[PDB]
Design a protein around this ligand. Structure first.
Ligand SMILES: [Co+2]
Ligand SMILES: [Co+2]
Lengths: 422, 422
């Protein structure tokens, strides 16, 4: 190392190149590259020098390669490279460099961007977006992957949400990347899109205008859960928007697609599928009816019954939001009850957290108001739904809620028992 | 009714009495007392007239009785009585009335008070507390029961919390009632105390000052779970207070008692027991060491693995809080690991909601930091805990968390994987 460090500091171009190649090779070890000793040798800032505008490209590639092996190490190791002010140089190399040079720069920039939110912003402010977006006009798959990966690292994060004026510039490229033949590329593009869709209406509408929604919906039935997961996450973030934005996703045909995801052997997919659906049933009466017409209630009721809690929780919201539209269209409630949602709802009370008990009690109450409403509409002397709940053992569970510490809950419980089971 | 209404409005005493008796009788029907028909009759204000100070006591009783049957009906019916100015007369009857009159008055007041926080405050504001506490100097079980139940309704409610200057006057009486032989009385007294115990530091301190804690602890081993629940709830509320207030409960011997409750056939007792413990391990080092010395970790680790989620969740907090104390005394962490908390903690990650995942990742990161420090203090070239976690399958689960939408979680995950599994 002392010997190499010498060559590197030599003024002989040929000797500098000889040294950088060496530092690049040791930093390329698959085992445990002596990154820390290299940093301890103080040759980082020198290697950074070799990436300057007028250095020979071979020297630039070797130096960037070496620095990239370092920047892709631990966070500490990344800080060193960043502090040597390598980022601005990696970025100009994105414009100038050969494919090989570009592959190192984009990788290194991706690691800096994915290190933390402050580095994410640093990179964005160094204006990496322009040169990064130009990489997609190339035809090398591997280079496009890294680039897409780095792009997702720039879009990710919600405490400091990334500078939207900058990151939104990626939407057009992203809209094309989700048609990629490369699976890894597809995956990261969908993750990036989900990150951009994890924001206000402005963000969501932006994703809608570049016509990404329909492609996202087609990707829900991709053979791989690695593609399905981020695609669903993105769809889920989009339907969190307003009713108009959600209808866009619905006209793209997301409902029939969701029907398949509810059967996914992947628990988190069933979970986010129920989550997505609950943000659609949280919409207007016509959107709730659409969920009904797509035959999404039956599988939902089933999950409410057998899935893990984290999924049941989601199924409940979906069903409870659906029952909210029952005040208007009473037949929605009638349909929910027909699909056997009462038993699952009652049982849930026994294992749910307080927020879910509130949600579940809302659904049960809406169900009771309905059964009460057409009980009067007829000369009947019984509230069928109330009777339904009693049989399912729900009465006893609602009674038990009277001892819950939460005011909203126990008060909701007393009112229910008193009103329908007195 | 038309005839009774007439007699009721008569100036003839013997007539008013006879008619009040008849209204009382029909409003006493076990079946479905015609309360609404009686209200429609418009005689409520008239009956209220009959409870005034100058009225013959028999008329006072029959009128109060009649109105109490109405007041103990639906909220809407209770409202009719409250709006007729009955409350202040029920209260003055609580002083002057015979035992029979008092029994009606206290049942009416309890129903008004339990209706809502508005009626609760109105009742407290009408100075009902003075004659109510005065009923405890009586020697009739049934009366003391209803009186205790009423006191419970008056102390309940946390959104508007009840006027502390008023409800706190019940502590001395409450401190004595928890030594009662009557189960119902004891139950209600314990509930009333748990409600008083859910306030700020002052409320908790007043409960400690009148020396209720030790009795609460003794009651944790009461044969009936109807007594243990509210007693455990009250104890739980007290330990949410500061470290000093928490030591009072510890010195009362709560730990051995909780150890027993961790095997309660009641899921919610196991749950609040874990919750109670978690609020003790959230204290200083000595308090965490006390939990350890009482042998609470093993049963805690067992629940973390096999209990319902709502309980596991509580066990996780208890164990996780304990590990935070590991920084100071590294042997706390070593002990936790020795009791096999790692495996159940990793598995929890697969089914936990985001807040619990965060709690779990902190526990795991503390354990992991400990295994790292010792590997250093020793020449070991392995982080035993990291290896335990990897063996348990928690490595992959932690890895998966990197795709969680929550920033604090995925950052935590990437940080862990990079730092201990690289
Ligand atoms: Co990194
Ligand atoms: Co009531």
């Amino acid at each position: 190392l002392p010997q190499m460090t010498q060559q590197l500091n030599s003024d002989d171009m040929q000797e500098q190149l000889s040294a950088t190649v060496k530092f690049r090779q040791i930093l390329s070890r698959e085992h445990r590259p002596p990154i820390d000793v290299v940093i301890q040798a103080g040759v980082v800032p020198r290697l950074v020098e070799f990436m300057r505008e007028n250095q020979p490209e071979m020297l630039q590639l070797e130096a960037a390669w070496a620095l990239t092996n370092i920047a892709s190490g631990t966070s500490a190791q990344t800080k060193v490279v960043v502090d040597a002010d390598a980022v601005p140089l990696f970025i100009q190399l994105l414009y100038t460099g050969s494919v090989e040079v570009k592959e190192q720069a984009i990788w290194a920039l991706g690691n800096v961007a994915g290190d933390s939110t402050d580095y994410r912003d640093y990179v964005l402010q160094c204006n990496a977006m322009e040169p990064i977006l130009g990489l997609f006009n190339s035809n090398k798959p591997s280079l496009i992957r890294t680039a897409t990966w780095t792009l997702s690292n720039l879009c990710r994060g919600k405490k400091p949400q990334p500078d939207w004026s900058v990151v939104s510039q990626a939407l057009p490229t992203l809209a094309k990347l989700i048609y990629s033949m490369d699976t890894e590329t597809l995956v990261d593009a969908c993750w990036a899109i989900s990150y951009l869709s994890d924001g206000p209406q402005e963000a969501i509408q932006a994703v809608i205008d570049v016509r990404i929604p329909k492609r996202l919906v087609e990707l829900l039935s991709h053979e791989s859960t690695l593609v399905q997961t981020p695609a669903l996450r993105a769809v889920g973030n989009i339907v969190t928007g307003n009713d108009l934005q959600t209808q866009v996703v619905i006209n793209a045909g997301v409902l029939p697609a969701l029907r398949l995801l509810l059967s996914s052997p992947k628990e988190n997919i069933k979970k986010e599928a129920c989550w997505t659906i609950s943000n659609i049933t949280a919409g207007n009466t016509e959107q709730i009816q659409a969920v009904i017409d797509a035959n999404l209630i039956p599988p939902l009721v089933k999950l409410l019954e057998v899935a893990e809690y984290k999924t049941k929780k989601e199924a409940c919201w979906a069903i409870s939001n659906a029952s909210s539209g029952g005040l208007q269209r009473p037949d929605i409630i009638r349909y929910l009850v027909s699909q056997g949602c009462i038993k699952p709802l009652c049982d849930l009370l026994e294992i749910a957290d307080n927020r879910i008990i509130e949600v579940t009690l809302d659904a049960l109450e809406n169900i009771l108001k309905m059964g009460e409403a057409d009980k009067e509409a007829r000369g009947l002397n019984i509230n069928e739904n109330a009777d339904f709940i009693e049989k399912a053992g729900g009465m006893e569970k609602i009674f038990n809620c009277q001892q819950n510490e939460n005011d909203k809950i126990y008060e909701k419980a007393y009112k229910i028992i008193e009103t329908y089971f007195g």
